């Protein structure tokens, strides 16, 4: 009759039901959050940049409609 | 309706599908709100976080009518406005006339970019209309 505590058996069986997941790990990209602030400040300045690439996504659009519209 | 109920599907069956284990008689094992703190904690905390305590501040006998709602943002208006208007006035040589009241509201907060200067007999505005209405040569008339 001594009243047993607990255990772990069945568990890898349970764990393996639904498996062992990671999630496409590096999602394709990170999960965000945190870092070293002097680096983080600098990276924004090289993502300033994004408005440059949006005018590169417009550069091509203009080229197609200025070469000829025929 | 009777026929849909699980019951129909669930007779000859004791438990009512409740589990053969769990001969859970017709009682709470819980009961209403409370006990949230001991035996339901994790849930409680989790699913209804910000509860209890009370803090910030209060306005006794508050009379909420008095605040009763006022807000609209821009393009919104034009739509209310006759399309004729909205497909015309643009130039500034015809400012169609909008009385906020019918629209309800009272306050104007930004947004929109419209498609005709017009007059809004309007009661309050964000910063933006000085930069929007005004920028547009659209118009606010505040009420008096």
């Amino acid at each position: 009759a001594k009243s047993k505590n607990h255990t772990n058996h069945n568990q890898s069986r349970k764990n393996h039901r639904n498996g062992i997941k990671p999630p496409l790990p590096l999602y394709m990209y990170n999960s965000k959050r945190g870092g070293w602030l002097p680096a983080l400040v600098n990276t924004r300045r090289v993502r300033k940049n994004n408005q440059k690439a949006a005018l590169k996504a417009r550069r091509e659009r203009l080229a197609a409609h200025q070469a000829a519209q025929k | 309706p009777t026929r849909f109920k699980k019951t129909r599907h669930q007779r000859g069956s004791t438990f009512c599908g409740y589990g053969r284990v769990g001969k859970h008689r017709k009682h709470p094992s819980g009961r209403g709100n409370a006990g949230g703190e001991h035996h339901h904690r994790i849930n409680f905390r989790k699913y209804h976080p910000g509860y209890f305590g009370k803090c910030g501040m209060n306005h006794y006998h508050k009379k909420k009518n008095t605040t009763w709602k006022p807000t609209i943002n821009l393009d919104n208006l034009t739509k209310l406005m006759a399309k004729d208007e909205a497909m015309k006035a643009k130039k500034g040589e015809a400012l169609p006339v909008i009385d906020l009241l019918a629209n309800g509201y009272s306050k104007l907060l930004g947004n929109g970019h419209l498609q005709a200067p017009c007059i809004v007999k309007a009661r309050w505005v964000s910063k933006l209309a000085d930069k929007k209405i005004r920028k547009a040569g659209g118009a606010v008339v505040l009420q008096a």
Partner: protein
């Protein structure tokens, strides 16, 4: 499929599946129900048993709700309705809903035999 010919029997049984001990309690009746029965050997498909009905047994879907004389009995109360049947020889025999009083049978019967198309009523036991 049946006849002529498959390579074996057309059912594995059809003697009705009932409770068990029906036979025992007289207020107990002979209808098939699933044993619940916690220790039930009947559930547990222990050997000693009787059978239950299951989808493996099923009659060939092609070959089912088909009579002995090869027709599904089709319910009928009247001659007009019967007059519709005419095409059929494949899979129906009209069965007169006997279930509705007679005089009309005198009419139906007359027309039907006259019309030369089967009805079991009109074809069974000692009279036609």
């Amino acid at each position: 499929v049946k006849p002529f010919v498959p390579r074996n029997i057309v059912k594995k049984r059809t003697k009705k599946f009932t409770r068990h001990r029906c036979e025992l309690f007289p207020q107990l009746s002979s209808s098939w129900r699933k044993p619940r029965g916690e220790d039930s050997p009947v559930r547990r498909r222990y050997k000693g048993q009787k059978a239950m009905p299951n989808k493996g047994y099923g009659s060939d879907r092609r070959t089912k709700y088909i009579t002995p004389s090869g027709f599904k009995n089709f319910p009928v109360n009247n001659v007009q309705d019967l007059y519709m049947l005419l095409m059929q020889n494949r899979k129906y025999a009209g069965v007169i809903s006997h279930t509705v009083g007679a005089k009309a049978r005198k009419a139906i019967v007359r027309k039907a035999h006259e019309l030369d198309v089967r009805l079991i009523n009109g074809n069974a036991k000692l009279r036609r």
